[PDB]
Amino acid sequence: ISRYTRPEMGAIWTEENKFKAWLEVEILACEAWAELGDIPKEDVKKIREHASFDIDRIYEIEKETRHDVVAFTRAVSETPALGEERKWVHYGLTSTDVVDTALSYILKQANEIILKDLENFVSILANKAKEHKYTIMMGRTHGVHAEPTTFGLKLGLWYEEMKRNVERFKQAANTVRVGKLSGAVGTYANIDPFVEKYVCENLGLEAAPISTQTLQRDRHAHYMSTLALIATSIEKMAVEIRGLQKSETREVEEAFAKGQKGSSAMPHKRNPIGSENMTGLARVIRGYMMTAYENVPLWHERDISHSSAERVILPDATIALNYMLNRFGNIVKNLTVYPENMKRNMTRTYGLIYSQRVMLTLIDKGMVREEAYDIVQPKAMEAWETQVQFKELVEADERITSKLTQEEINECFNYEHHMQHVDTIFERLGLNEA
């Protein structure tokens, strides 16, 4: 927080929203007991109607008690309009029956938002890919010219990566979509198992099949690792935008608005600042992942060490990821692409990108692979170091030119060959209407 927090996600993590969730858990729990016949219907009707809290009082009481949940229930007890029935608030419950169930309910909400952000990002990627299906450009391996590809295929790669991440996310969201109301040490000793079933059902959560004082933190570790993975996928794509905007390359550029200023001292600057910002946040979220894993080995039926960490990392990770998904989705959507610079750059390594095809054709004419490679390599290295065209050199090279005709040589130097399966890949990905 706070320039990295959008309003939708910030709102779910307020104290107000937390205490509201606690109150709802408590009231549902009394309603469950009343269904069982263990406490009177009339008592709980009153609790549902009149039970409330004043946050400032919660905090005042907490100054004495040094205990959140006790402060909360004692504050609820002082609601103008509750009478004796206040008796039943927290009946049979332990602290984390409320805290963990409420926390899972809040995460359920966060995860609905994140799922929607992720689906929207996938659509943006799909739309960009279709736009640049045949936008030809150099493929680069080790940062060096390899062979041609298209910007659409690059975006199609990202699209498919994010679909993998949507699936992973659903599984992670599910592992934390659970509540527990099993009492002090998870035994149900003081609280009928039906109470948990009812409360969880009414919050859209599953009931933990077995619990201690708390939910088990393997769930939250799985969850954070998935958040960190999504962020790290986004960093991968941001790193790519940054590389393509480099001045020698300029195949792409982040949208630059009227009135924008790129730097304080250099009026000419247009920078990939959005993508750089995403890179930073991905690092923070990976740190949260390490924290989450360290929260797993809790002692016995619990220690509370995870809570102080989760107070930080759960709001911060979800807030940051929501911000990243929305901001970077807009960066991609509004991204300027320069097909002319892409084609020009394919020119800049003297046609050396055709070296494999010359080699493979030599093999077709019955040369052994290492013999073909070793004829072609010195020619390629000569072009590098004397900066003369590679086709010239193979044409002026008589042991190739004895095995390949001129029209065979020319076919080796045609980039169109490399576009032959773009449509078939897109068809697989679902990116056509063929």
Rounded to the nearest whole angstrom, what is the least distance from the CB of residue 120 to a copy of itself in the complex? Answer: 19
- Interface pattern 47-86 for a copy of itself (x via CB under 8 A): -----------------xxxx-xx--xx--x------x-x
Stretch that binds a copy of itself, among 40-48, 103-111, 113-121, 359-367 (CB under 8 A): 359-367
Which residue, 381 or 396, is less far from a copy of itself as judged by CB? 381
- Residue 50 near residue 81 (C-beta atoms within 8 A): yes
- Rule CB under 8 A: which of 304-343 touch a copy of itself? 304-313, 316
Cα–Cα dist 367/376, whole Å: 12
Tokens 């332990």 label which residue?
A: 94
Sole binder of a copy of itself in the list 51, 110, 332, 352 (CB under 8 A): 352
Note if 142 is an active site residue.
Answer: yes
Of positions 5, 216, 330, 401, contacts a copy of itself by CB under 8 A: 216
Neighbouring residues of 358: CB distance < 8 A, sequence distance ≥ 6: 376, 394, 400, 404, 409, 412
In the region spanning residues 140 to 199, those forming contacts with a copy of itself, defined by CB under 8 A, are 140-149, 153, 156-157, 160-161, 164-165, 168, 171, 175, 183-190, 193
Q: CB of 336 within 8 A of CB of 253? A: yes
Active site residue 50: no
Using CB under 8 A, pick the residue from 8, 127, 373, 408 that binds a copy of itself: 373
Q: Under rule CB under 8 A, which residues in 83-142 are in contact with a copy of itself?
A: 84, 86-95, 98, 138-142
- H/E segment holding residue 269: none
What is d(CA 95, CA 75) in angstroms, rounded to the nearest whole number? 15
The DSSP bridge pattern shows strands 178-179 and 144-150 to be unpaired
Instruction: Give least dist CB 245 to a copy of itself, A.
Output: 6
Identified catalytic residue from 142, 264, 308, 402: 142
Distance of CA 411 to the CA centre of its chain: 43
Burial class (CB within 10 angstroms; exposed 0-12, middle 13-18, buried 19+) of 197 = middle
Of 268 and 433, the one with the shorter C-beta distance to a copy of itself is 268
Q: How far is the CB of 64 from a copy of itself (least distance, A)?
A: 4
Number of residues that bind a copy of itself (CB under 8 A): 167
Angle between helices 422-429 and 151-175 (to 10 degrees): 20
Out of 52, 145, 211, 263, which one is annotated catalytic? 263
3-state SS assignment for residue 147: strand
Q: Choose, by CB under 8 A, the member of 267, 398, 406, 434 that binds a copy of itself.
A: 267
Q: Is 414 in the site for a copy of itself (CB under 8 A)?
A: no
Residue numbers preceding breaks in the chain (C to N > 2.5 A): none
For residue 177, the minimal CB distance to a copy of itself (Å) is 13
**Quick one: 116 or 283, whose CB is closer to a copy of itself?**
283
First to last CA, the chain: 45
Q: Which residues of 318-339 are buried (b: 16+ CB within 10 A; e: fewer)?
A: bbbbbbbbbbbbebbeebebbe
**Which residues are the active-site residues?**
142, 263
